């Protein structure tokens, strides 16, 4: 957990050759102590101090661990820890070197690089995920009374069913 957060993204290419260095399972499974005993107590005590504080911490963790799942849902990336997008690296002005980024730069310094335009990227991504990609997919299966009738696409289908 967090075991190479100080490494460069090339030595934190090591982090995402493992489970993003165990970050997500540490997000949801560090609940296990307050999951193991909010209920092992059999005591009256007539009032509760943790009955609001622990509950607020718990539902705070849950809504934070659902906003990110919904944001991966909105960019077609739901399930996939590492996925690619149709949004290009745009006019976004931190254009620099590949062998500088993924060899000698930590994740935190990288966050300091692109601390601006991050909401620009987040607004930008769903645009190419939806506004044309979903509409192109809607163009796919509407008009083809000739979808049963396909003669020169069998080769891709055969390749595709094996690989």
């Amino acid at each position, epitope marked *: 957990f967090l075991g190479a957060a100080g490494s460069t993204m090339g030595a934190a290419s090591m982090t995402l050759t493992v489970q993003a260095r165990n970050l997500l399972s540490g997000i949801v499974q560090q609940q296990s102590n307050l999951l193991r005993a909010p209920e092992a107590q059999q005591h009256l005590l007539k009032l509760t101090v943790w009955g609001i504080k622990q509950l607020q911490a718990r539902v705070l963790a849950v809504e934070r661990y659902l906003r990110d799942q919904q944001l991966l849902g909105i960019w077609g990336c739901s399930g996939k820890l590492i996925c690619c997008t149709n949004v290009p690296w745009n006019s976004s002005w931190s254009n620099r070197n590949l062998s500088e980024i993924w060899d000698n730069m930590t994740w935190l310094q990288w966050d300091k690089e692109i601390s601006n335009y991050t909401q620009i990227i987040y607004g930008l991504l769903e645009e190419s995920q939806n506004q044309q990609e979903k509409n192109e997919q809607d163009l796919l299966a509407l008009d*083809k009374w*000739a979808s049963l*009738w*396909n003669w*020169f696409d*069998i*080769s*891709n289908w*055969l*390749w595709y069913i094996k690989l």
Partner: antibody, heavy 127, light 109 residues
């Protein structure tokens, strides 16, 4: 790369039938749509029809259907075309062409386009 | 049957001219499936742009296809002395197909 060494040009009596070969080399004889095209010696180009050797799917011509025969014999790894009724208006060059694939190889996802080709021989009848 | 009808005549352009062709058809090809076929007399008719948008590794970048639906478009920025030949496009959409009509590009004196 993918090499389609077509058999040579031929002379033959008119009114008879004709056979031509296209021996592939490299990539895969099967699992990719080998096909066949025409061009009259001076005209543009013209597609006729093909074959898929793993499932013998024959997708034939809009007009030459019934007179064309394409096979696929993977046990000696060739591909033959049999046309009939030789005539001065069957005179065209007959290129044998294979569908290509993505990446530099012969195994990945196909493209749908006649990428790799063969040398072609003019199939002209003799009087 | 989709009668593919490209329609510039002789593309009598100078060496170094934008080789833009008409490249249409009778009706719309399904799923924009079009391939782009350069051809020389006696040689192999060679693919340029598969799917009318993407180009394989090895084909020169000066070949460039565009358009969709019924009529596509090919532009070629630089005209080299070896590309002066006849150009066609061909559908891989509907189960029947036909090639381009024939547009010759040449050296212009």
């Amino acid at each position: 790369q993918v090499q389609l060494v077509q058999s040579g040009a031929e002379v033959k009596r008119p009114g008879s039938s004709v056979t031509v070969s296209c021996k592939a080399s490299g990539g895969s004889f099967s699992t990719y749509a080998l096909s066949w095209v025409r061009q009259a010696p001076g005209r543009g180009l013209e597609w006729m029809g093909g074959v898929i050797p793993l499932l013998t799917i024959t997708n034939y011509a809009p007009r030459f259907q019934g007179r064309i025969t394409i096979t696929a014999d993977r046990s000696t790894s060739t591909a033959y075309l049999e046309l009939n009724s030789l005539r001065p208006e069957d005179t065209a060059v007959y290129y044998c062409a294979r569908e290509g694939t993505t990446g530099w190889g012969w195994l990945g996802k196909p493209i749908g386009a006649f990428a790799h080709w063969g040398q072609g021989t003019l199939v002209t009848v003799s009087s | 049957e989709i009668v593919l009808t490209q329609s510039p005549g002789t593309q009598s352009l100078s060496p170094g001219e934008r080789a833009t062709l008409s490249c249409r058809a009778s009706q719309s090809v399904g799923n924009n499936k079009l391939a782009w076929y350069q051809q020389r007399p006696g040689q192999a008719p060679r693919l340029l742009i598969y799917g009318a948008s993407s180009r394989p590794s090895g084909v020169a970048d000066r070949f460039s296809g565009s358009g969709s639906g019924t009529d596509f478009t090919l532009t070629i920025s630089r005209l080299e002395p070896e590309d002066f030949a006849v150009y066609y496009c061909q559908q891989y959409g509907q189960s029947l197909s036909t090639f381009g009509q024939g547009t010759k590009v040449e050296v212009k004196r």
